[PDB]
Design a protein around this ligand. Structure first.
Ligand code: NA
Ligand code: NA
Length: 724
C-alpha cells in the first residue's frame, strides 16, 4: 500500500529548517509535517486542542509537595545528578507511566534515553565557564526558563514494557489539570547514543552548530547525508573511547546492550544514508534532495501506544508514504485532482481551486486550514551606545525601525483590507495580534485591538503624526551625538548626507512577494525612505533572518508566515514567541531585543498611552478580569513583554503567580497591549486555505483548524471501501 503526498516546495528546497533534537530543530512546517509521523510524543495535543495520553499517562497528581532526597536534576558544572532542590515545596508532583517503543534501528527505548534528553537540556542551556563548548545561546533562550521550573525527577521503576517517573516542578496551569501534570513529559524521540554523538560533534567541531548557519558553520541536520557521515564517524569513535557517559551508568540496565546499540544505529545510517532515527510509526527510508523527494515506510515494530484513548487508537494503514516537492501551486492541485497523487499536504487559498471540471471536483475532498497567519517582523538592531544607529564595519546607518514610535506608526499605515481583498483575493482576514478568529482566545484579546482603535482600513493621518514625532525625537537625540538626520527638500530622509535605505525580504513561493512590494511602495517609500523588495525562497529567508545575527543589517523587514500543526485551546507561547526577547527577537541567533541590548516598553507606558495619561482609563480599555484597578496593577507597572511572556510560559515571574484563569487571560491581554505598542511585529492577516485529498481516502481525524498538517490526519487515513 502506497500513499503519494505533495508538499509545496521552492525550486531548490523542500525544507526551511533542519532535523535535530535541539529546540532549534524542526523550526519549519515542511520538516515538521514529515517528522510528526517519524517521532511520537508521550502526551501529544489532539484535534480538540488539549493534550491526550499516548506513550505516557498521568498516574498521580498532587500540588504543594516536598521534593524528596531521591528526586534529581542534572548539574552541568560536575556532570552529575544532584538532589539540588530536596526539601523545597514543588507546586506540582506528577507520577507518569510510559511504554517503551522500539527505535527505527531496532533497539528498545529506555529510561537512559529520557535521562540523557533532560541532562542534555540542563547541560546545553548553561554556559559552565566562559569557554564551555557544551553551550548553545539559542538553546538557553528557548529552554533555560523551562528547565528552571523543574525541581527534580526520579526513575521509580523500569520493566520490559513500562517506565515510571516521579516529577516535581513549579508549573501550575489554572484551566487544565493535564497541562499542569504533563508540563514535563519523561519521554524522547532520539536514542541517547546518537544524541551523544551529535553533542560531541557540535561541541568539538566548529563547522557544526545546533542553532546557527553562516559561511563556515552548518546547522546540524540529521537528514543531510554529509552531516550523517560526520555523526556516524563520531558515534563509532565514542563506541571505542567512551561508549557510556559516567552520568548515565545508573540508568543503564545492560552496558553490553547499550554498547551493541551503537552498531544497530550505525547499520541503520549505512542502509539509509541519513541520521534520522525515531520511535514513531514511519522511518525515513530515503531522501533525494536533488528530486525534492522523501520516502518514509511503516516500522513493523511500532504498535498503538499503550495509553491511547479510543479516538487516537489509529494504526496507520499505509505501508509506504512518498513525499513529492512540487514548486507550482496549480500543478500541485491538478496532480491531485487528476488522481496522480493522493494528498495535497500543503493548503492553498480558495481562488487556486478554480477552473476544475465537475469530475476533477468530484475526485477530491477539501479540508480547511485556518491556523496560518502572516506578519511583518522589523530588524530593530542598533549599537550598545546608540539607540538609533547600527555600525557595520566602517559604515554607520540610521535604523528607522530601532525607533519605537516608527514601528508603532506602521500599525496604522498598513491597509489590511487592501492586503486581504487584493493580494489574497478575499481568502484571508485582517489580523492584529497572534490569535486567529478560529482560536478560543480571539475574543479574550480583541479588547486590546479596540483599545488601540486598529481597523482593517489604514489611518495614514494618525500613522504620519506618530511617524513624524518618532523621527523628530530621533533627529534631536542624534544631533546631540554629532549625527544629522534631516528631511531633504526632495521629501527623502538623509543620515550624514546619504539617503536612509531599507531592504524588505518577501518570499518567491507565494503572495508574500506582493506583501513585500506593498510595504516597500505604499509604506517605506511614502515615509521618505529609499526602499527595495528582495524576493527569496524558504532557505535564504531562514538563513538571513532566523539562523544568523541581525547585526549584519542585511534585512530591515521580512514577510513572516506562521502555521500551527495542531488546534490549541490554551496557548502559553503567543507572548514569548512573538513579543518577548527569548525566542524570535527577531531571529533565533545573535543579537535580540533584550532589555540589556535595547530600551523596552513597560506596562505603565502602554496604560498611559491607552488612557491619555490616566492609568485607570487605560486599564478600563483592556477588558481585564483581575488586573482591572490601579491598586491591583501596581506590581506589573514596570513589566515588559518579557515578564508577561515568562509568567504565561513558566507559570511565574518576579514572584507573581499565574494561579487563576482570569490571570492567564489578563497576562495575554496586557502582554499583547505591550506587543502592539512596541511594534516589533506588525500582524496583517490570517489565511483561509484548503488541503485536497483523493475522494478514495477517508481521514477520520481532521484537525478543525490545522487540517492535514496534524499528523493525526495521515495516521488515520485509509482507503474508502464502497460497492456503489
Ligand atoms: Na553547558
Ligand atoms: Na561547533
Amino acid at each position: 500500500s502506497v500513499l503519494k503526498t505533495v508538499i509545496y516546495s521552492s525550486s531548490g528546497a523542500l525544507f526551511m529548517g533542519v532535523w535535530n533534537p535541539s529546540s532549534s530543530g524542526y523550526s519549519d512546517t515542511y520538516s515538521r509535517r514529515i517528522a510528526d509521523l517519524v517521532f511520537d510524543s508521550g502526551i501529544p495535543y489532539g484535534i480538540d486542542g488539549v493534550p491526550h495520553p499516548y506513550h505516557c499517562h498521568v498516574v498521580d497528581y498532587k500540588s504543594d509537595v516536598t521534593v524528596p532526597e531521591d528526586a534529581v536534576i542534572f548539574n552541568s558544572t560536575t556532570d552529575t545528578w544532584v538532589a539540588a532542590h530536596a526539601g523545597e515545596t514543588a507546586k506540582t508532583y506528577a507520577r507518569i507511566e510510559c511504554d517503551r517503543p522500539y527505535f527505527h534501528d531496532g533497539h528498545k527505548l529506555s529510561a537512559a534515553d529520557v535521562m540523557y534528553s533532560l541532562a542534555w537540556s540542563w547541560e546545553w542551556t548553561t554556559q559552565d565557564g566562559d569557554d564551555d563548548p557544551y553551550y548553545d545561546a539559542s538553546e538557553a533562550d528557548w529552554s533555560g526558563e523551562y528547565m528552571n521550573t523543574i525541581l527534580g525527577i526520579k526513575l521509580v521503576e523500569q520493566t520490559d514494557d513500562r517506565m515510571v517517573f516521579d516529577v516535581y516542578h513549579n508549573h501550575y496551569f489554572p484551566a487544565s489539570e493535564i497541562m499542569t501534570a504533563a508540563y514535563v513529559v519523561p519521554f524522547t524521540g532520539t536514542p541517547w547514543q546518537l544524541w551523544y554523538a551529535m553533542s560531541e560533534l557540535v561541541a568539538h567541531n566548529p563547522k557544526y552548530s545546533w542553532s546557527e548557519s553562516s559561511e563556515d558553520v552548518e546547522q546540524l541536520d540529521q537528514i543531510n547525508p554529509s552531516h550523517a557521515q560526520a555523526i556516524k564517524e563520531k558515534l563509532l569513535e565514542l563506541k571505542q573511547s567512551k561508549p557510556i557517559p559516567e552520568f548515565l551508568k545508573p540508568y543503564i540496565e545492560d552496558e553490553n546492550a547499550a554498547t551493541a546499540a551503537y552498531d544497530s544505529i550505525a547499520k541503520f545510517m549505512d542502509e539509509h544514508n541519513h541520521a534520522v532515527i525515531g520511535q514513531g510509526p514511519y522511518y525515513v527510508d530515503e531522501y533525494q534532495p536533488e528530486n525534492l523527494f522523501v520516502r518514509i515506510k511503516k516500522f513493523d515494530k511500532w504498535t498503538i501506544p499503550a495509553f491511547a484513548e479510543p479516538e487516537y487508537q489509529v494504526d496507520p494503514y499505509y505501508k509506504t508514504i512518498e513525499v513529492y516537492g512540487i514548486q507550482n501551486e496549480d500543478t500541485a492541485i491538478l496532480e491531485v485532482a487528476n488522481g496522480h497523487y493522493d494528498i495535497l499536504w500543503y493548503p492553498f487559498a480558495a481562488y487556486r481551486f478554480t477552473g476544475l471540471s465537475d469530475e476533477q471536483r468530484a475526485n477530491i475532498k477539501l479540508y480547511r486550514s485556518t491556523s496560518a497567519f502572516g506578519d511583518i517582523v522589523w530588524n530593530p538592531v542598533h549599537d550598545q551606545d546608540n539607540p538609533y544607529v547600527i555600525t557595520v564595519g566602517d559604515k554607520k546607518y540610521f535604523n528607522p525601525f530601532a525607533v519605537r514610535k516608527v514601528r508603532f506608526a506602521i500599525q496604522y499605515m498598513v491597509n489590511r483590507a487592501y492586503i486581504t481583498q487584493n493580494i489574497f483575493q478575499g481568502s484571508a482576514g485582517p489580523m492584529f495580534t497572534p490569535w486567529t478568529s478560529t482560536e478560543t482566545g480571539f475574543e479574550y484579546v480583541r479588547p486590546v485591538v479596540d483599545a488601540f482603535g486598529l481597523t482593517e482600513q489604514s489611518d495614514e493621518d494618525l500613522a504620519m503624526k506618530l511617524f513624524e514625532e518618532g523621527m523628530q525625537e530621533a533627529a534631536q537625540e542624534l544631533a546631540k551625538m554629532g549625527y544629522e538626520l534631516k528631511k531633504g527638500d526632495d521629501g527623502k530622509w538623509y543620515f550624514n548626507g546619504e539617503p536612509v535605505k531599507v531592504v524588505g525580504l518577501g518570499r518567491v513561493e507565494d503572495e508574500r512577494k506582493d506583501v513585500a512590494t506593498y510595504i516597500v511602495e505604499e509604506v517605506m517609500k511614502k515615509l521618505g525612505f529609499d526602499a527595495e523588495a528582495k524576493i527569496v525562497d524558504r532557505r535564504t529567508a531562514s538563513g538571513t533572518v532566523y539562523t544568523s545575527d541581525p547585526s549584519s543589517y542585511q534585512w530591515n523587514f521580512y514577510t513572516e508566515g506562521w502555521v500551527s500543526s495542531s488546534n490549541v485551546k490554551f496557548s502559553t507561547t503567543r507572548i514569548i514567541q512573538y513579543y518577548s526577547s527569548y525566542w524570535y527577537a527577531p531571529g533565533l541567533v545573535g543579537w535580540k531585543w533584550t532589555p540589556e541590548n535595547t530600551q523596552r516598553v513597560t506596562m505603565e507606558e502602554v496604560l498611559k498611552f491607552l488612557g491619555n495619561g490616566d492609568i485607570q482609563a487605560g486599564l478600563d480599555s483592556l477588558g481585564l478580569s483581575y488586573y482591572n484597578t490601579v491598586d491591583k496593577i501596581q506590581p506589573l507597572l514596570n513589566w515588559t513583554a518579557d515578564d508577561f511572556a515568562l509568567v504565561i510560559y513558566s507559570g511565574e515571574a518576579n514572584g507573581v503567580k499565574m494561579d487563576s484563569e482570569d490571570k492567564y487571560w489578563d497576562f495575554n491581554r496586557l502582554g499583547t497591549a505591550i506587543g502592539i505598542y512596541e511594534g516589533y511585529r506588525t500582524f496583517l492577516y490570517e489565511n483561509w486555505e484548503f488541503y485536497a485529498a483523493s475522494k478514495d481516502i477517508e481521514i477520520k481525524l481532521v484537525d478543525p483548524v490545522a487540517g492535514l498538517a496534524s499528523d493525526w490526519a495521515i495516521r488515520s487515513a485509509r482507503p474508502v471501501v464502497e460497492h456503489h
